[model samples]
Target: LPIMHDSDRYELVKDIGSGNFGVARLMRDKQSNELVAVKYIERGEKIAANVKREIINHRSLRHPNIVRFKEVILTPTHLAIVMEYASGGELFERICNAGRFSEDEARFFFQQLISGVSYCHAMQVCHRDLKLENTLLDGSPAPRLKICDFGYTVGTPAYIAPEVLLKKEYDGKVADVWSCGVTLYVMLVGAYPFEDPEEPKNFRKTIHRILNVQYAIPDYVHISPECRHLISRIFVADPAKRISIPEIRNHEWFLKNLPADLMNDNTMTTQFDESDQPGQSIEEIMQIIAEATVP
Candidate 1:
């Protein structure tokens, strides 16, 4: 199952996803027969170093709400990192299909997600790509949410403080909190907080609104005012004033409303077994990259 000579071992099955740095494949161990994911990075790319850094970062951290890295495999053409597989799929798909989440379910997932992010902050890691697509559910009756994807992450942005978004370098931990706040808003509303159909052609404008404008919660949603208040604190335009992970975890919204059992460590195992379909078209991935470019 090893890809490179003197490298760690794992068997590649099929392609799961691809991004700016590399492609991810579904893999398994011949000895253990356990499923895992392997991300392959192409050689000679600027992102190659970043991918390696992310692998090292993932392998060093351990937390219940975070995905665990098993090993790193280096091949002649690429570098691959093996990790535990989450089978419940992305949170965005689940929300899109169901329309919205029950109050209890939303609170449970949001709590778990913030707990994991808090753990990362404690360890000095930043997840720049914090979005619904990067959050996966562990397949259980009461599923757990795990944050994935550390590709766009970096340790600096001052105005965004503690985050170095694009060209600016600040604080990594604080930027993560900002992203988490945006994610929480998406979870409760079932849509991105800044997206507008009228401005469909302006991606920069959309991002500008996210980074500059205040997010408004619709009146029809049933979330508690305490939760809304917490979201606002994290979503503040001034990163220095943004709430920290400790404050978020101990916010009145969580302390008074979340149940004790929900805060406990509950492991989720995969329930579905779908392999990547070979020769699948990558048009969607291409379109995404095209749309992401600044005009």
Candidate 2:
């Protein structure tokens, strides 16, 4: 755990992001000699509880693929969350610039993402919202991409699980697997396996298809049979049958390119699955507008 950042010790460089709830800014922690993101939310009864939960969900999490939590500053006016900063940007931009990745490249990213989620489940935390936009790229050639923002992160529309769409108290772990399926499909082929964001009718089709697991991969997008098989297993309407995180991580398609150590690492004992990681506006790169200023 890091220190509760005092107003003076932590320097706010600039505001970088905001959604309906709060603003996230780039900041420098002088004591730790590191950069971080500080999200400031106006304090209120309903929001105060949510902020505490977010802190619990994040501070306890320590994974290479999950954004790191550092400290918290609670004041009468606002509650500030301090977290590790990713220098590169969101994975959304990388995918856009590169267009699409080959099966091997997609496998690499997917593997990391799965491992991250698996870790969260091990800690009894459910992301409940997983999508490409919340997926962030760290500053490195062989960069580490992480999932960020757990606010209003219950679930997003396109990546939401069917049971959730049906207004049910679905299993968080199971629901996350559904999102992972959609996420993998989007990453591999550069498009969601679902319909447009919204329309009264669109929600019906989305839910109807989700209820029955009806979806289509682009005709021209050639991928392995193993990959398609994994998608089918995850995108199913029944949460009971939907795969778990460790199971997905160990699935044939996911293992095709995994490192030997991870492939054989049996120390893990938790059954894991489910996910969230939202979009705002026409594009989500809006979350990555601030560049890191070390000074």
**lDDT for each of the candidates?**
0.59, 0.64
- The alpha-carbon root-mean-square deviation between model 1 and the true structure, to one decimal in Å, is 10.3
Per-residue C-alpha lDDT of model 1 across residues 186-263, encoded as one tens digit per residue? 678876666553336355655666666445777788888788788778777667888888888788876666655443
Name the candidate that leads on TM-score: 2
Clash number for every model? 13, 12
Please identify model 1 stretches exceeding 4 Å from their true place.
1-22, 29-33, 40-54, 73-80, 125-133, 149-167, 197-201, 256-295
For candidate 2, give the lDDT of residue 23. 55
lDDT of 2 at 144: 69
**Candidate 2 lDDT tens digits, 1-295:** 2223475777866675553223567777666645677766554533544555566666666666777766655544555556777777666567667776778888888887787777776775454554444777766567666776466343346687878778647677787777777778777777566664324436656666666777888777898999889988998887888788878867888877586433221224422121111112212221111111111
TM-score, predicted candidate 2 vs. hidden true structure: 0.72
TM-score of each: 0.68, 0.72
- Please report the candidate that would top lDDT against the real structure: 2
